[PDB]
């Protein structure tokens, strides 16, 4: 009945946010989403979308004819030019998407690390990493204490004595 965080597995139960908290104490188990990390990721992804929606004001008109085919030579030049340009945009499109997707994935991983590192700095010397993305808290942490961690109102000074004791022996 153990719980685990990021590092081999996501949470299919976290359905109200992208990033979140999962605790277990005497009160049982719980899961809640972190707003600030979730919104940062959402704002960045939607930011990409808007950039890719920015339409062009360039209008293009017919340069050949599909009812009455133009002269061969000028027609082959045109086809050659269009096909050359289509190759360029096909290349651009492929690269743009691959590039953005790599970045989307990386910045998402970044937000996860930043959330983990923040919590680590909140807990100071009162906790230890279990290596699955969790923190073993070396003091009693009820639901109110867990909530204090989620909204950054956790004062490590309050539990430090009790925690260092349990850690050292």
């Amino acid at each position: 009945g153990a719980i685990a965080g990021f590092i081999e597995n996501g949470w299919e139960g976290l359905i109200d946010g992208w990033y979140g908290f999962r605790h277990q104490n005497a009160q049982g188990e719980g899961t809640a989403a972190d707003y600030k990390s979730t919104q940062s990721a959402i704002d960045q992804i939607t930011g990409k979308l808007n950039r890719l929606i920015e339409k062009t004001n360039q209008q293009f008109e017919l340069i050949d004819n599909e009812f009455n085919e133009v002269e061969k030579q000028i027609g082959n030049v045109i086809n050659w030019t269009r096909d050359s340009i289509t190759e360029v945009w096909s290349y651009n499109a492929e690269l743009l998407v691959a590039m953005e997707n790599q970045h989307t994935i990386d910045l998402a991983d970044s937000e996860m690390d930043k959330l983990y590192e923040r919590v680590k700095r909140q807990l100071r010397e009162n906790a230890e990493e279990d290596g699955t993305g969790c923190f073993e808290i070396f003091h009693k942490c009820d639901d109110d204490c867990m909530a204090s961690i989620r909204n950054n109102t956790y004062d490590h000074s309050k539990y430090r004595e009790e925690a260092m004791q349990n850690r050292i022996q």
Binding site: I3, N9, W11, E12, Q59, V70, W89, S90, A98, I105
Partner: protein, 318 residues
Amino acid sequence: DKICLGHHAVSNGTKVNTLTERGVEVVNATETVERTNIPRICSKGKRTVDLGQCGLLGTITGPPQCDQFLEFSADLIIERREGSDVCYPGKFVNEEALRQILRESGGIDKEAMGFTYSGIRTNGATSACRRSGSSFYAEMKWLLSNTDNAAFPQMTKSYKNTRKSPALIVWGIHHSVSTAEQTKLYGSGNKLVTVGSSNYQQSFVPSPGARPQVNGLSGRIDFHWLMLNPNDTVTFSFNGAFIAPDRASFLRGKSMGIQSGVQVDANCEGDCYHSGGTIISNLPFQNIDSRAVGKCPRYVKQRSLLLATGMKNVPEIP
């Protein structure tokens, strides 16, 4: 007591491509390449003319098919495959360039050129231009000799464009089926037509000879055109085989022309067209038609390029 940091995940994962991986699953993705076509010409907001059987160049010369469009006005011009520029068999020299000009003209305004004739017939008509009875191009005059085989007097007609926009001028050269027919219409001897401007100079001779029957006719009229600058003048010198203009054309404003084989729709609002319909999309790319015109997403070879809109999908350890 324990607190874990995690991220959401689904079993409903969709594959995308990156620099490194091919088919890496992300939580959510959206398409960037439009493939959804609307098989209509969405014309709402645009003054639209469907030329139908009228060929675009016919609007200038005026075969019976184009009588409604002799002074048409439009924002959106639609050519149809059934369209024909011609009643009496023939074709324009530099036709496509002229088409490209008319497609963005915004329609045409016609104005009389004021040519008067003496010692000559002007009522040249044909069975191929049936309008009630035998007739001819509405904007043109088929000049003959007077009786039959009689000599066609040398003539010189000029026209000044007194307007502030360039004038579109069109004339025709008639190629009879035989030198016997050419003589019957314009008299014996060689025939010459000279067209002079102040930035244009060309010359024309007819070429009588047998040709395959088109519309039952083996004769050909080939049309020529120029743009006349403001206050400039065109002069016509000729002695037969000349199809004279009655009116000049002036471009109204701005438009866009397309070639299509689907119906028109004045409810839909669109801005990117192709022969198969309208592309309405905020997507950057499309895979529908490489020759689409207007304001369009760029055409690409690929039918699908998925953009990750979510993080990498990592299934929960069960």
